[PDB]
């Protein structure tokens, strides 16, 4: 379609479904998720967001990203640090896993951020808008499946404190995306990069499922 | 004594006890704190930390604070935003109270940060080491007293995730504090500012208790 945001949503319909159909996520949706499985996804997210937000801060003033720079509304790193301290303990930094599939995702993020900046919006879109949409249904399933103690920690990642209205914010974000100026060629690569983002998540889900079934 | 860290500890021994004996804090230690009372404490902390961390960022390059600048290890603003969203909802920002006692604390922080930043270390020490030290004790008490739902949020403030050992961190911090260079005059004021910090907290507790019982 004309609007970039509309083009992204349409082009990634297929891959988003594969993400949903992935064995690990199927089990997740079916409410079938274990603490060992959930700890792995949280560890993954920490690594992914550290890299993503590291690159966002690097190109925050570039006209290829500035329009969608919302640091206070979206930053998740601090939230994940808090969560991992709960799931893995005070020494979480020394014990959390950093797998090959997590590394492949992180590696692509730094490449885009350092050599293909104009494609960063594709990864920010995929992660931020997805976690802000499907993230809340998974939040509901997670807590009613994890049987957590009432310690008041472990799920800060699923709450965006600086965003009063999700729908309202997502509309604003869509607008800022459509305001980005790019040659039709660049637009094609941003669309493809978004699909690549889903594929990186899907291969991660495949790997985590493999690690948990031994 | 000779070391700044030891001088501050000895000089504030009196006011610390008063703070511990303030009715509101006394009732908190005894597990006697309501959700409304706790929310007022968190609201207070948010304002105080926003102001403190705002001024720290302003003077982080200056030699009067640089030595004790540990952003990743100690920043609390984000954790408090996460908790307030849980305690007050998506629009916490526009509904949390801002009382005169909270304001007097905030005002003094900006005054110090803008006109005599060489004293900011007194406020950083008081707040950070105070919350880090007793944080674990008060955390368990809060859990038992508030009977939170199992949604994994609401007490992130009580966990400093980027600090594996509170003991080891405080040793390094005290070390950095003693490396601080200052004239004998300024040093006397730093010690005095530490007392003022405690009195600002004591005054805050007296107000919260008054709001809760009239």
DSSP string across chain A: --SHHHHHHHHTHHHHHHHHHSHHHHHHHTT---HHHHHHHHHHHHHHHHHHHHHHHHSTTSTTTGGG--HHHH--HHHHHHHHHHHH-TTHHHHS---HHHHHHHHHHHHHHHH-GGGHHHHHIIIIIHHTTTHHHHHHHHHHHH---SSS-S-GGG--TT-S-HHHHHHHHHHHHHT----HHHHHHHHHHHHHHHHHHHHHHHHHHHHH--
Q: Is A185 within 8 Å of chain B by CB? A: no
Under 8 Å between Cβ of B165 and B52 = no
Report the CATH superfamily, name and number, of domain A1-214. Answer: Heme oxygenase-like (1.20.910.10)
Q: What is the DSSP letter of B116?
A: -
Return the structure tokens found at A116: 């293909």
* Binding-site positions of A for heme b: 9, 16, 125, 174
- In 3D space, the residue among B171, B138, B184 whose CA is nearest the CA of residue B45 turns out to be B138
Residue of B nearest to A165 (CA): B90
- State the resolution, in angstroms: 2.2
Under 8 Å between Cβ of B38 and B29 = no
A151: Cβ–Cβ under 8 A, 6 or more apart, which residues?
A86, B143, B148, B152, B155
Chain A residue numbers touching B35 (CB-CB < 8 A): none
Burial A96-123 (b: 16+ CB within 10 A, else e): beebebbeebbebbeebbeebbbbbbbb
Chain A residue numbers touching B142 (CB-CB < 8 A): 152
Count of Cβ atoms closer than 10 Å to residue A9 Cβ: 16
- In 3D space, the residue among A166, A197, A143, A162 whose CA is nearest the CA of residue A76 turns out to be A162
Under 8 Å between Cβ of A162 and A95 = no
Chain B residue numbers touching A82 (CB-CB < 8 A): 79, 82, 156, 159, 161
> Could you tell me how far CA A109 lies from the centroid of its own chain?
11
Q: Is A167 within 8 Å of chain B by CB? A: no
Inter-chain residue contact A82 with B79, CB threshold 8 Å: yes
Q: Is A43 within 8 Å of chain B by CB? A: no
Count of Cβ atoms closer than 10 Å to residue A167 Cβ: 9
Return the structure tokens found at A29: 């949706």
Q: Is B29 within 8 Å of chain A by CB? A: no
Inter-chain residue contact A81 with B164, CB threshold 8 Å: no
B195: Cβ–Cβ under 8 A, 6 or more apart, which residues?
B11, B12, B15
Burial class (CB in 10 A: 0-12, 13-18, 19+), A166: middle
Return the structure tokens found at B207: 């107000």
φ/ψ region of B43 (left if φ > 0, alpha if ψ in -120 to 50, else beta) reads: alpha
Q: Is A151 within 8 Å of chain B by CB? A: yes
The minimum CA-CA distance between B80 and chain A, rounded to whole Å, is 9
Which of B83, B90, B161 is nearest residue A81 as measured by Cβ atoms?
B161
Distance of alpha carbon A202 from alpha carbon A25, whole angstroms: 9
Distance of alpha carbon B118 from alpha carbon A214, whole angstroms: 58
């Amino acid at each position: 379609p004309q609007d970039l945001s509309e083009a992204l949503k349409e082009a990634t319909k297929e891959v988003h479904t594969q993400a949903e159909n992935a064995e690990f996520m199927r089990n997740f949706q079916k409410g079938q998720v274990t603490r060992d499985g959930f700890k792995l996804v949280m560890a993954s997210l920490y690594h992914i967001y550290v890299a993503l937000e590291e690159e966002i801060e690097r190109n925050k003033e570039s006209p290829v990203f500035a329009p969608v720079y919302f640091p206070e509304e979206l930053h998740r790193k601090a939230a994940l640090e808090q969560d991992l301290a709960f799931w893995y303990g005070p020494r979480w930094q020394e014990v959390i896993p950093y797998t090959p599939a997590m590394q492949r995702y992180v590696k692509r993020l730094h490449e885009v951020g350092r050599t293909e900046p104009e494609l960063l919006v594709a990864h920010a879109y995929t992660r931020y808008l997805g976690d802000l949409s499907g993230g809340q249904v998974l939040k509901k399933i997670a807590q009613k499946a994890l049987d957590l103690p009432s310690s008041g920690e472990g799920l800060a990642f699923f709450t965006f404190p600086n965003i009063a209205s999700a729908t309202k914010f997502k509309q604003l974000y869509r607008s800022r995306m459509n305001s980005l100026e790019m040659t039709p060629a660049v637009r094609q690569r941003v669309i493809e990069e978004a699909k690549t983002a889903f594929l990186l998540n899907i291969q991660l889900f495949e790997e985590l499922q493999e690690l948990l079934t031994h």
